[PDB]
């Protein structure tokens, strides 16, 4: 099929019982007529045929085509977004602004990610994506307030308030985690949103919505490690944060038996302890020797070489060291 055979067909979308077809509709309608409006209506209809699943639209349809799609949707139903609000709105124009701002947050999060550079038209798409990402960076706070205010509202193809809140609150927590790299206090809000998402997902278990369980689990683990408000890794982390090192030595001696912690983690904490003793705190010298000895036994049991730190610590050997 094509854009013309689909334009005359009022039932072709009702027969194929797609995203490539949607981007074909947008590409033909990319240039500015009644054919344009018909193409937008068909694209919106077939997009709505998927129950508005941004988890399938985001991956295939690129950022500018999806931007055009939901901008056309907002032109269709609605009429800044932060100053307008009016969350007690008709269903369609509620979930439309909801989905648009969820998309806004999701693409900000996705744009922050690193993509694989293509080793081997592209310039126009790059410029357009850069421009829309720039204006999104300008107005990301408005979207955050809109989604946050909407999450506080539970007035209401109506969708369940539980799933409509869990998806958006997950997006809020992801956005805060994106900004958590800059302002560490932002992580607390991400923690609360993520715990709400975990509780809601465990409660209802909705499917349409569907969330990556592994991503949510890793998000919750990261928030637990970062903001405190257990496995030996987190035990070592809190012990280092609280200034207690004897339990670090004991859990390292136990780790020599279990072989649980990464060797890289042990070498890094040994280096951090050496750096802190280097900075001051003469009370750390025995702690540095103790964890160095623990790492050395871990290394010999794993069949790896003895470090330079151990060898220089055994210059001037002492009874207690031995």
């Amino acid at each position: 099929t094509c854009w013309f055979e689909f334009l005359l067909e009022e039932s072709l979308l009702e027969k194929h019982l797609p995203v490539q077809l949607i981007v074909q509709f947008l590409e033909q309608a990319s240039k500015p007529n009644k054919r344009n409006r018909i193409l937008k209506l068909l694209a919106l209809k077939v997009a709505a045929h998927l129950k508005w699943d941004l988890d399938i639209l985001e991956k295939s349809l690129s950022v500018p085509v999806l931007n055009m799609l939901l901008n056309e949707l907002l032109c269709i139903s609605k009429v800044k977004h932060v100053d307008m609000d009016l969350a007690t709105l008709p269903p369609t124009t509620a979930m439309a602004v909801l989905l648009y701002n969820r998309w806004a947050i999701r693409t900000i999060v996705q744009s922050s990610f690193p993509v694989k550079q293509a080793k081997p038209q592209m310039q126009q798409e790059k410029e357009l994506t850069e421009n829309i990402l720039k204006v999104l960076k300008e107005q990301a706070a408005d979207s955050i307030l809109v989604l946050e205010a909407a999450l506080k509202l539970n007035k209401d193809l109506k969708v369940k308030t539980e799933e409509m809140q869990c998806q958006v609150c997950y997006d809020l927590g992801a956005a805060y985690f994106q900004q958590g790299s800059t302002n560490s206090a932002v992580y607390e809000n991400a923690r609360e949103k993520f715990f709400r998402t975990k509780e809601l997902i465990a409660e209802i278990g909705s499917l349409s919505c569907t969330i990556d369980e592994k991503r949510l689990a890793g998000y919750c683990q990261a928030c637990d490690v970062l903001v405190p408000s257990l496995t030996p890794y987190s035990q070592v982390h809190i012990c280092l944060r609280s200034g207690n090192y004897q339990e670090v030595i004991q859990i390292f001696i136990e780790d020599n038996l279990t072989l649980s912690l990464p060797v890289q983690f042990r070498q890094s904490v040994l280096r951090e302890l050496f750096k802190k003793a280097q900075q001051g705190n003469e009370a750390l010298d025995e702690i540095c020797f103790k964890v160095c000895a623990c790492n050395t036994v871990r290394d010999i049991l794993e069949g790896r070489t003895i470090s330079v730190q151990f060898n220089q610590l055994f210059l001037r050997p002492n009874k207690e060291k031995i």
Binding site: V109, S112, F113, P114, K116, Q117, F177, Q178, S181, S184, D212, K214, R215, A217, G218, Y219, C220, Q221, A222, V225, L226, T231, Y233, S234, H237, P262, Q264, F265, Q267, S268, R271, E272, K275, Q278, Q279, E282, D285, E286, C288, F289, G303, R304, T305, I306, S307, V308, Q309, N311, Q312, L313, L315, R316, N318, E320, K321
Partner: protein, 275 residues
């Protein structure tokens, strides 16, 4: 642990025509080299050599714990002879790190350094020995740059989806970033990301190593920055005074890599806090 009659028989094998029009080279290639050596014996030979070097480097042997100060002059001597042995320098040998695109002009030298590191495993041991004295690792910056360029080239040219299919290169990348961190050519936040290298794919570890290169261009592994703090008798680098000592953009790209793979790097998120 380093790496590495005629006419009578010919007449007998003859049939009234030669058939083959020649013999390429001297015939068949040999069955290649063979290696058989104990790993533990290698470990303890390395231990005896490294203990001797630490004895030679340290000052002659108060607090009943702690260690003597390794001489930065002795470790500087070890570093400069390591540089001379592995790559006789003066193509690019200034301590300043050049732009990343300059690595595409010295690629033969970087591959030579990479092969030397691969063949002779104790080059990493002597590298850590150099790193034990802080300012001495600056004088070995050519080796660090060359090995980093070789590893970046490998990760860019890796079609595998995980770093586990490149065991030596994974270990070399981990060891190289750990050695820079130990020598304080990186801040503790940037020097901790050898934990995650086993979890990532080649392109993000390539990005993180490029962030190492960018940070070293921005700050520079120079010995003049290592101020002599005489409270103990050894050199100190404090990146905070240099401005952006946390490595702002480099921390940003590392946190983006973490957030991409948050499903598996959740537990490691605590090793990269800027405060």
């Amino acid at each position: 642990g380093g790496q590495v009659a005629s006419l009578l028989d010919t007449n007998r094998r003859h049939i009234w025509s030669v058939f083959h029009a020649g013999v390429i080279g001297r015939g068949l290639k040999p069955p290649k080299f063979v290696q058989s050596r104990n790993q533990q014996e290698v470990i303890y030979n390395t231990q005896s050599l490294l203990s001797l070097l630490v004895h030679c480097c340290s000052a002659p042997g108060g607090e009943c714990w702690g260690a003597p100060i390794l001489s930065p002059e002795a470790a500087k001597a070890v570093a400069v002879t390591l540089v001379e042995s592995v790559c006789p320098d003066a193509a690019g040998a200034e301590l300043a790190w050049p732009p990343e695109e300059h690595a595409r002009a010295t690629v033969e030298r970087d591959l030579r350094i990479g092969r030397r590191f691969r063949e002779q495993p104790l080059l990493f041991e002597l590298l850590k020995l150099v790193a034990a004295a802080p300012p001495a690792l600056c004088y070995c910056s050519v080796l660090l740059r060359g090995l980093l360029a070789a590893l970046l080239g490998h990760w860019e040219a890796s079609r595998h989806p995980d770093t586990t299919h490149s065991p030596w290169h994974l270990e070399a990348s981990c060891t190289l970033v750990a050695v820079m961190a130990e020598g304080s050519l990186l801040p503790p936040a940037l020097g901790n990301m050898h934990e995650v290298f086993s979890q990532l794919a080649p392109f993000e570890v390539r990005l993180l190593l490029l962030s190492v290169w960018g940070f070293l261009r921005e700050h520079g592994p120079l010995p003049q920055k290592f101020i002599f703090q005489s409270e103990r008798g050894r050199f100190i680098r404090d990146f905070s005074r240099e401005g952006g000592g946390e490595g702002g953009p480099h921390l940003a790209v590392l946190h983006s890599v973490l957030h991409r793979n948050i499903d598996r790097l959740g537990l490691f998120s605590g090793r990269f806090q800027a405060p």
